[PDB]
């Protein structure tokens, strides 16, 4: 309802295909479907992971303050509170 868009891991994991490039960057779900080409860094790097923990890759690069605010402009919602209370630890990677 209501609030933000609390999406579950599995749901977000569907959103990586053809044309719904979601990513989760620090507990927050961003649709970047219309940002792919705009991204001063490119579509592919975005589309590589998609529907999942692009936090790792995002923070590897670190990203500027600008990008952080610009994330908010693309914010659709958050990780479902269920998993949020228990971010039992990702199997990892890359
Ligand atoms: C909320 C989503 C994101 C936003 C709003 C965003 C925004 C930006 C912005 C503004 C820059 C410019 C950096 C600069 O001026 O130095 C940038 C660069 C870049 N981003 Fe992102 N980004 C996002 C997610 C990602 C993710 C998840 C990846 C990796 C999978 C990625 C990889 C890169 C890379 C590699 C560059 C720089 C490439 C180069 O060296 O020229 N970004 N991003």
From Swiss-Prot:
It is found in: Endoplasmic reticulum membrane; Microsome membrane. It is a single-pass membrane protein. The keyword Chloroplast does not apply. Residues 4-80 form the Cytochrome b5 heme-binding domain. One of its GO terms (molecular function) is electron transfer activity. GO terms for cellular component: endoplasmic reticulum; endoplasmic reticulum membrane; intracellular membrane-bounded organelle; membrane. One of its GO terms (biological process) is response to cadmium ion. Heme binds at residues 39, 63. The keyword Zinc-finger does not apply. Keywords: Acetylation, Electron transport, Endoplasmic reticulum, Heme, Iron, Membrane, Metal-binding, Microsome, Transmembrane, Transmembrane helix, Transport. Its main location: endoplasmic reticulum. The modification N6-acetyllysine is found at residues 2, 5, 14. Belongs to the cytochrome b5 family. Cytochrome b5 is a membrane-bound hemoprotein functioning as an electron carrier for several membrane-bound oxygenases. This is Cytochrome b5. It comes from Rattus norvegicus (Rat).
């Amino acid at each position: 309802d209501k609030d933000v868009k609390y999406y579950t891991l599995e749901e977000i994991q569907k959103h990586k295909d053809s044309k719904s490039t979601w990513v989760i960057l620090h507990h927050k779900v961003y649709d970047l479907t219309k940002f792919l080409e705009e991204h001063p860094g490119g579509e592919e790097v975005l589309r590589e992971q998609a529907g999942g923990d692009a936090t790792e890759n995002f923070e590897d690069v670190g990203h500027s303050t600008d990008a952080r605010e610009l994330s908010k402009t693309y914010i659709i919602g958050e990780l479902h509170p269920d998993d949020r209370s228990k971010i039992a630890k990702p199997s990892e990677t890359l």
